[PDB]
Coordinates of all heavy atoms in Angstrom, one line a residue:
Chain A
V35 N 1.4 36.6 37.2 CA 2.6 36.6 38.0 C 3.8 36.8 37.1 O 4.0 36.0 36.1 CB 2.7 35.4 38.8 CG1 4.0 35.4 39.6 CG2 1.5 35.4 39.8
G36 N 4.6 37.8 37.4 CA 5.9 38.0 36.8 C 6.9 37.4 37.7 O 7.1 37.9 38.8
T37 N 7.6 36.3 37.4 CA 8.7 35.8 38.1 C 9.9 36.2 37.3 O 10.0 36.0 36.1 CB 8.6 34.3 38.2 OG1 7.3 34.0 38.7 CG2 9.7 33.8 39.2
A38 N 10.9 36.8 38.0 CA 12.2 37.3 37.4 C 11.9 38.4 36.3 O 12.6 38.4 35.3 CB 13.0 36.1 36.8
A39 N 11.0 39.3 36.6 CA 10.8 40.5 35.8 C 10.3 40.1 34.4 O 10.5 40.8 33.5 CB 12.1 41.4 35.7
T40 N 9.5 39.1 34.3 CA 8.8 38.7 33.1 C 7.6 37.8 33.4 O 7.7 36.9 34.3 CB 9.8 37.9 32.1 OG1 9.0 37.3 31.1 CG2 10.6 36.9 32.7
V41 N 6.5 38.0 32.7 CA 5.3 37.1 32.8 C 5.8 36.0 31.8 O 5.9 36.3 30.6 CB 4.0 37.7 32.4 CG1 2.9 36.7 32.3 CG2 3.7 38.9 33.5
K42 N 5.9 34.8 32.3 CA 6.7 33.8 31.4 C 6.1 33.6 30.0 O 4.9 33.4 29.8 CB 6.8 32.5 32.2 CG 7.8 32.7 33.4 CD 7.7 31.6 34.5 CE 9.1 31.0 34.8 NZ 9.9 32.0 35.6
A43 N 7.0 33.8 29.1 CA 6.7 33.5 27.7 C 5.8 34.5 27.0 O 5.4 34.3 25.9 CB 6.2 32.1 27.4
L44 N 5.6 35.7 27.6 CA 4.8 36.8 27.1 C 5.5 38.1 27.1 O 6.0 38.6 28.1 CB 3.4 36.9 27.8 CG 2.5 35.7 27.9 CD1 1.3 36.0 28.7 CD2 2.1 35.1 26.5
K45 N 5.4 38.9 25.9 CA 5.8 40.3 26.0 C 4.7 41.0 26.8 O 3.6 40.6 26.8 CB 5.8 40.9 24.6 CG 7.0 40.4 23.8 CD 6.8 41.0 22.4 CE 8.0 40.7 21.5 NZ 7.7 41.3 20.1
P46 N 5.1 42.1 27.5 CA 4.1 43.0 28.2 C 3.0 43.4 27.3 O 1.8 43.4 27.9 CB 4.9 44.2 28.7 CG 6.3 43.8 28.7 CD 6.5 42.6 27.7
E47 N 3.2 43.6 26.0 CA 2.0 44.1 25.2 C 1.0 42.9 25.1 O -0.2 43.2 25.1 CB 2.5 44.6 23.9 CG 3.2 43.5 23.1 CD 4.0 44.1 22.0 OE1 5.2 44.5 22.2 OE2 3.5 44.2 20.8
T48 N 1.5 41.7 25.1 CA 0.6 40.6 25.0 C -0.2 40.4 26.3 O -1.4 40.1 26.3 CB 1.4 39.3 24.7 OG1 2.1 39.6 23.5 CG2 0.5 38.1 24.4
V49 N 0.6 40.5 27.5 CA -0.1 40.5 28.8 C -1.3 41.5 28.8 O -2.4 41.2 29.2 CB 0.8 40.8 29.9 CG1 0.1 40.8 31.3 CG2 2.0 39.7 29.9
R50 N -1.0 42.7 28.3 CA -2.0 43.8 28.3 C -3.1 43.4 27.3 O -4.3 43.6 27.7 CB -1.4 45.1 27.9 CG -2.5 46.2 27.8 CD -3.2 46.4 29.1 NE -4.2 47.5 29.0 CZ -5.2 47.7 29.8 NH1 -5.4 46.9 30.9 NH2 -6.1 48.7 29.6
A51 N -2.8 42.8 26.2 CA -3.8 42.5 25.2 C -4.8 41.5 25.8 O -6.0 41.4 25.3 CB -3.2 41.9 23.9
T52 N -4.4 40.6 26.7 CA -5.4 39.7 27.3 C -6.4 40.3 28.2 O -7.4 39.7 28.6 CB -4.7 38.6 28.1 OG1 -4.1 39.2 29.3 CG2 -3.6 37.9 27.4
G53 N -6.1 41.6 28.7 CA -7.0 42.3 29.5 C -6.5 42.6 30.9 O -7.1 43.2 31.7
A54 N -5.2 42.1 31.2 CA -4.7 42.4 32.5 C -4.5 43.9 32.7 O -3.9 44.6 31.9 CB -3.4 41.6 32.7
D55 N -4.8 44.3 33.9 CA -4.7 45.7 34.3 C -3.5 45.9 35.3 O -3.0 47.1 35.4 CB -5.9 46.2 35.1 CG -7.2 46.3 34.3 OD1 -7.1 46.6 33.1 OD2 -8.3 46.1 34.9
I56 N -3.0 44.8 35.8 CA -1.9 44.9 36.8 C -1.2 43.5 36.8 O -1.9 42.5 36.5 CB -2.5 45.3 38.2 CG1 -1.4 45.0 39.4 CG2 -3.7 44.4 38.6 CD1 -1.8 45.7 40.7
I57 N 0.1 43.4 37.1 CA 0.8 42.2 37.3 C 1.4 42.1 38.6 O 1.6 43.2 39.2 CB 1.8 42.0 36.1 CG1 2.9 43.1 36.2 CG2 1.1 42.0 34.7 CD1 4.1 42.8 35.3
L58 N 1.8 40.9 39.0 CA 2.5 40.8 40.3 C 3.9 40.5 40.0 O 4.3 39.7 39.2 CB 1.8 39.6 41.1 CG 2.4 39.4 42.5 CD1 1.3 38.7 43.4 CD2 3.6 38.4 42.4
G59 N 4.8 41.2 40.7 CA 6.3 40.9 40.7 C 6.7 40.2 41.9 O 6.4 40.6 43.1
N60 N 7.4 39.0 41.8 CA 8.0 38.3 43.0 C 9.3 38.9 43.6 O 10.4 38.8 43.0 CB 8.3 36.9 42.6 CG 7.0 36.0 42.4 OD1 7.0 35.2 41.5 ND2 6.1 36.2 43.3
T61 N 9.3 39.6 44.7 CA 10.4 40.2 45.4 C 11.6 39.3 45.6 O 12.8 39.6 45.2 CB 9.9 40.8 46.7 OG1 9.0 41.9 46.4 CG2 11.1 41.3 47.6
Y62 N 11.3 38.1 46.0 CA 12.4 37.1 46.3 C 13.3 36.9 45.2 O 14.6 36.9 45.3 CB 11.8 35.8 46.8 CG 12.8 34.7 47.0 CD1 13.5 34.6 48.2 CD2 13.0 33.8 46.0 CE1 14.4 33.6 48.3 CE2 13.9 32.8 46.2 CZ 14.6 32.7 47.3 OH 15.5 31.6 47.4
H63 N 12.7 36.6 44.0 CA 13.5 36.3 42.9 C 14.3 37.6 42.4 O 15.5 37.5 42.2 CB 12.6 35.8 41.8 CG 12.0 34.4 42.1 ND1 10.8 34.3 42.7 CD2 12.6 33.2 42.1 CE1 10.5 33.0 42.9 NE2 11.6 32.3 42.5
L64 N 13.6 38.7 42.4 CA 14.2 39.9 41.9 C 15.4 40.3 42.8 O 16.4 40.8 42.4 CB 13.1 41.0 41.8 CG 12.0 40.8 40.7 CD1 10.8 41.6 41.0 CD2 12.5 41.2 39.4
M65 N 15.3 40.1 44.1 CA 16.3 40.6 44.9 C 17.6 39.7 44.8 O 18.7 40.2 45.0 CB 15.9 40.6 46.4 CG 15.7 39.3 47.0 SD 15.1 39.3 48.7 CE 16.6 40.0 49.5
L66 N 17.4 38.5 44.3 CA 18.5 37.6 44.0 C 19.0 37.8 42.6 O 20.2 37.9 42.4 CB 18.1 36.1 44.2 CG 17.7 35.6 45.6 CD1 17.3 34.2 45.6 CD2 18.8 35.9 46.7
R67 N 18.1 38.0 41.6 CA 18.5 38.1 40.2 C 17.4 38.9 39.5 O 16.3 38.5 39.5 CB 18.5 36.7 39.7 CG 18.9 36.6 38.2 CD 19.4 35.2 37.9 NE 18.4 34.2 37.8 CZ 18.6 32.9 37.6 NH1 19.8 32.4 37.4 NH2 17.5 32.1 37.5
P68 N 17.7 40.1 39.0 CA 19.1 40.7 38.9 C 19.6 41.6 40.1 O 20.7 42.0 40.0 CB 18.9 41.7 37.7 CG 17.5 42.1 37.8 CD 16.7 41.0 38.4
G69 N 18.8 41.7 41.2 CA 19.2 42.6 42.3 C 18.3 43.8 42.4 O 18.0 44.4 41.3
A70 N 17.9 44.2 43.6 CA 17.0 45.3 43.7 C 17.7 46.7 43.4 O 17.1 47.5 42.7 CB 16.4 45.4 45.1
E71 N 18.8 46.8 44.0 CA 19.6 48.0 43.7 C 20.0 48.1 42.2 O 19.9 49.2 41.7 CB 20.9 48.0 44.6 CG 20.7 48.5 46.0 CD 20.1 47.4 47.0 OE1 20.0 46.2 46.6 OE2 19.9 47.7 48.2
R72 N 20.3 47.0 41.6 CA 20.6 47.1 40.1 C 19.3 47.5 39.4 O 19.4 48.4 38.5 CB 21.0 45.7 39.6 CG 21.3 45.7 38.1 CD 22.0 44.5 37.6 NE 23.4 44.6 38.0 CZ 24.3 43.7 37.9 NH1 24.0 42.5 37.5 NH2 25.5 43.9 38.4
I73 N 18.1 47.0 39.7 CA 17.0 47.4 39.0 C 16.7 48.9 39.2 O 16.3 49.6 38.3 CB 15.8 46.5 39.4 CG1 15.9 45.1 38.7 CG2 14.5 47.2 39.0 CD1 14.9 44.1 39.1
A74 N 16.9 49.4 40.5 CA 16.7 50.8 40.7 C 17.7 51.7 39.9 O 17.2 52.6 39.3 CB 17.0 51.1 42.2
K75 N 18.9 51.3 39.8 CA 19.9 52.0 39.0 C 19.5 52.0 37.5 O 19.8 53.0 36.8 CB 21.3 51.3 39.1 CG 22.4 52.0 38.3 CD 23.8 51.3 38.7 CE 25.0 52.2 38.4 NZ 25.3 53.0 39.7
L76 N 18.9 51.0 37.0 CA 18.4 50.9 35.6 C 17.1 51.6 35.4 O 16.6 51.6 34.3 CB 18.3 49.5 35.2 CG 19.7 48.8 35.3 CD1 19.4 47.3 34.9 CD2 20.8 49.4 34.3
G77 N 16.5 52.2 36.4 CA 15.2 52.9 36.2 C 14.0 52.4 36.8 O 12.9 53.0 36.7
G78 N 14.1 51.3 37.5 CA 13.0 50.7 38.2 C 12.4 49.5 37.4 O 12.7 49.3 36.2
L79 N 11.5 48.7 38.0 CA 11.1 47.4 37.3 C 10.2 47.7 36.1 O 10.3 47.0 35.1 CB 10.3 46.6 38.4 CG 9.7 45.3 37.9 CD1 10.8 44.4 37.4 CD2 9.0 44.6 39.1
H80 N 9.4 48.8 36.2 CA 8.5 49.1 35.0 C 9.3 49.4 33.8 O 9.0 48.8 32.7 CB 7.6 50.4 35.3 CG 6.6 50.1 36.4 ND1 6.9 50.3 37.8 CD2 5.3 49.8 36.4 CE1 5.9 50.1 38.5 NE2 4.9 49.8 37.7
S81 N 10.3 50.2 33.9 CA 11.1 50.6 32.8 C 11.9 49.3 32.3 O 12.1 49.0 31.1 CB 12.1 51.7 33.2 OG 13.0 52.0 32.2
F82 N 12.5 48.6 33.3 CA 13.4 47.4 33.0 C 12.6 46.4 32.1 O 13.1 45.9 31.1 CB 13.7 46.8 34.3 CG 14.7 45.7 34.2 CD1 16.0 45.9 33.7 CD2 14.4 44.5 34.9 CE1 17.0 44.8 33.7 CE2 15.4 43.4 34.9 CZ 16.7 43.6 34.3
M83 N 11.4 46.1 32.5 CA 10.6 45.0 31.9 C 9.7 45.5 30.8 O 9.1 44.7 30.0 CB 10.0 44.1 32.9 CG 8.7 44.7 33.5 SD 8.0 43.5 34.7 CE 7.3 42.3 33.5
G84 N 9.4 46.8 30.7 CA 8.6 47.4 29.7 C 7.1 47.2 30.0 O 6.3 47.1 29.0
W85 N 6.7 47.2 31.2 CA 5.3 47.3 31.7 C 5.0 48.5 32.4 O 5.7 48.8 33.4 CB 5.0 46.1 32.6 CG 3.6 46.1 33.2 CD1 3.2 46.6 34.4 CD2 2.3 45.5 32.7 NE1 1.9 46.4 34.7 CE2 1.3 45.8 33.6 CE3 2.0 44.8 31.4 CZ2 0.0 45.4 33.4 CZ3 0.7 44.4 31.3 CH2 -0.3 44.7 32.2
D86 N 4.2 49.4 31.9 CA 4.0 50.7 32.4 C 2.7 50.9 33.3 O 2.5 52.0 33.8 CB 4.1 51.8 31.3 CG 2.9 51.8 30.4 OD1 2.0 51.1 30.6 OD2 3.0 52.6 29.4
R87 N 2.0 49.9 33.5 CA 0.8 49.9 34.3 C 1.2 49.5 35.8 O 2.3 49.2 36.1 CB -0.2 49.0 33.7 CG -0.9 49.8 32.6 CD -1.9 48.9 31.9 NE -2.5 49.6 30.7 CZ -3.6 50.5 30.8 NH1 -4.2 50.6 32.0 NH2 -4.0 51.1 29.7

Side-chain angles (χ1 to χ4, degrees):
Chain A
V35 175
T37 310
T40 167
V41 173
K42 293 165 128 72
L44 301 181
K45 291 174 173 178
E47 60 200 86
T48 305
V49 177
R50 176 59 179 167
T52 69
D55 293 325
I56 165 165
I57 62 171
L58 184 151
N60 292 139
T61 290
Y62 174 80
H63 294 98
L64 295 157
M65 69 182 290
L66 298 177
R67 182 159 74 181
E71 279 82 1
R72 178 168 288 170
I73 287 173
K75 182 173 203 91
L76 297 177
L79 179 57
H80 294 85
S81 175
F82 186 60
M83 73 180 291
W85 173 267
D86 69 7
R87 280 179 183 272

